[model samples]
Target: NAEEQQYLNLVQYIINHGEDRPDRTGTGTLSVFAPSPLKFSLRNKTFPLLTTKRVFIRGVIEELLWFIRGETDSLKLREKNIHIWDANGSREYLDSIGLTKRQEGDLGPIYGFQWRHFGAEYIDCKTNYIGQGVDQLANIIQKIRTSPYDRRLILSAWNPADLEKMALPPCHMFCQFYVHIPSNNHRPELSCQLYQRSCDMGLGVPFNIASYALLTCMIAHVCDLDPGDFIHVMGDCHIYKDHIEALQQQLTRSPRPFPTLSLNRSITDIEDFTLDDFNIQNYHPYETIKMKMSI
Candidate 1:
């Protein structure tokens, strides 16, 4: 249902109405997270549209796979066509190798690294010793599908102990996937709920949406179930004060129809997927809108 055209319209809408809006941050700076919630949905087989208005689709998809892979090093990301993290990721590299601001290269493991490598020490106290986000989500999904009666399917990442050591703590802190079994056809519907503790409207929200949505799809695939709705819940979701004009420009344009994202195949193992394994078709939008990523 979703192709390239819808992406362009959505980006154009954001560029038009999003820019220079007074209601954005109260300060009226060029804010991206305009304080107001920007809600959009993709139904059935449609993909969320994002034209080449500002960012290339390849970069977006590759970055998403990198996160889902639970990779900590930027080397893997650099191998792909995406390089959004080239500017600030260098600091992360330096910190990984026991160096501070003065030193560089291989900083300590960040979010992806922690998610894949670290133990239960990185999670919040109430999590009952759960490890990384991916593992937690996987466990919960299996439980939900296998036992529909149990209601405790929660995964968290806000660990007070590791906050100081982390280059950047988890912004989308926790997520839960609920499995609903229908008695009619025995076709299970999988719904994903995400809790983003903080969000940067301009730079982070897009990536967040793509990552979480892809995660939901992946879970559904492995569980042999149909994809349901993706519900993203946020806490400190705010737009930076500098991107107001851009937001206004975006709001002026009408949103195009959603597009479709096709995976290369039905992958059971999450780590088996690479950038080439997934394909995003029918993304149409206006020009590429450029915005600075706030560190």
Candidate 2:
């Protein structure tokens, strides 16, 4: 199926037409300033996980689970054998930014913290298990059930107050949820849209796409609705200069069918998911293409 072509083609388009520019990371990038919107319909049983590259489903799945828990630390992820964020979560880096007395593995108030706790005051990234703000995830779940037609079903991970404390400012910032009714007695179709202000198309975008796609599926399952669409709108979507070689290799390969994601069990609470609860079947992708993080 061509469900996965959107990702493969987006990269090709950027490399051919994007302007070569320098970025904050100092590695430089080829970037497109225009907004790029891509839509994936789940109605055809097509999961939107990338297929051209392996996309490292293991890391993607665990990272999403971390967000669901509303946690800001990397400790839980490390326990699951994930070092994906170790590069960013180092103690040396934290101290370099004036977090000299902070605890280890705390990524400050990043995605999960903002998702679950919106307006909480800034505190150390570690040792703060309490949130004194809005629970957007819980609110959205309730709103979807109580009023599917409500236009306020949005979840935002951008907390301006906590930005300074964050290990990294959010890349994929805004997320909106919508539930649509269908003909007959079919379960309502749940769709989501994510607005990412920054996307590393080579290393980060693949995981970002899959993370949100899988998130939509999980939310649909819990809300007892069928998965609908995932609309990804990106800004400053770019490929790092160092990543050009690996990405060029990707353009030569063809995409396989998207894999099926199966959650092994059902749960009412979003906070109760684990790595074991999900299975990604038939993910026969090409060998992994390693791209170093720009940090």
lDDT of candidate model 1 versus the reference? 0.57
* Candidate 2 ranges with C-alpha deviation above 4 Å: 125-131
Error of 1 at 3 (Å): 16
lDDT digits (tens) for residues 84-192 of candidate 2: 7786788887887887776778888899888877887757555455557788988888888889889999889887878888888899998898898784887789889
RMSD, every candidate, angstroms: 6.3, 1.7
- Each candidate's TM vs. the true structure? 0.73, 0.94
> Clashes in each model (backbone N, CA, C under 3 Å)?
56, 0
Instruction: Give the per-residue lDDT of model 1 (tens digit) for 185-279.
Output: 86677767778876666667667777766766776767676666666666655555655456556555555555677767767776677667667
* Model 1 lDDT, residue 13, Cα: 44
lDDT of 1 at 125: 16
Q: All candidates' lDDT scores?
A: 0.57, 0.82
Return the lDDT, model 1, position 113: 46
Q: Pick the candidate with the highest lDDT.
A: 2
Displacement of the residue 225 alpha carbon in candidate 1, Å: 1.1
